[PDB]
Paper text:
The formation of amyloid filaments through templated seeding is believed to underlie the propagation of pathology in most human neurodegenerative diseases. A widely used model system to study this process is to seed amyloid filament formation in cultured cells using human brain extracts. Studying templated seeding in cultured cells, and determining the structures of the resulting filaments, can thus provide insights into the cellular aspects underlying neurodegenerative diseases.
Although the resulting filament structures differed from those of the brain seeds, some degrees of structural templating were observed.
Author numbering:
A (entry chain B), B (entry chain C), C (entry chain A): 277 to 362
The structure:
Amino acid sequence: IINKKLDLSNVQSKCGSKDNIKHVPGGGSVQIVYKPVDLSKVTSKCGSLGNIHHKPGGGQVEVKSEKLDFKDRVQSKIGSLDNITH
Amino acid sequence: IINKKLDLSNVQSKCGSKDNIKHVPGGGSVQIVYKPVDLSKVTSKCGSLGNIHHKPGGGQVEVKSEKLDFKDRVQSKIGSLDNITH
Amino acid sequence: IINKKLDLSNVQSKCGSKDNIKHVPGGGSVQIVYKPVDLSKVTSKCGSLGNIHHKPGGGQVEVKSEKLDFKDRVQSKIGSLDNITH
């Protein structure tokens, strides 16, 4: 037996997975979970008088509330969330 | 037996999966989960007086509320969410 | 048996996973979890009078509240969240 390898790889495995995300407001509330999973391989080669511009966009999340009024009671009653049992 | 490999690969496996995402507001509420799974391989080669511009767009999420009024009670009563049992 | 390898790899495994994220406000509240999982390999080679600009965008999260009024009681009553039992 001869076993020979060159492992020049890039791996993401089970990344960013099985997140349990809950937002349970009375009111007037923001939850942002920003969770991209990105694998980038970039091999720019630039000779002579060339130019390479490598400027791929990122994620933008904008939430704007200009006016927001609650004129009576904001009320949450929670007995539980998300039960598990075995 | 001779086993020979060159592994020059890029892999994402089980990434960004099985997320449990819940939004249960009374009112006037934003949940953003920004979760792209992106694999990019880019091999720009630029000789002489060439130009390469590599500017693919990113994700944009915009939420705008200009005016929002609740003139009476905003009320959530939750006994549970999302039960599991074995 | 001959076993020979070159391991020149990049690995992320089980990273950023199984987060349990809860936001349970009465009102007027922001939760941001900024949790990208990023693997970047960059091999820029620049000869002669070339230029390489490598400027990929990052994540931007902006939350703006310009005006926000609660004119009566903001009230949360929680018996529990997220029970587990064995």
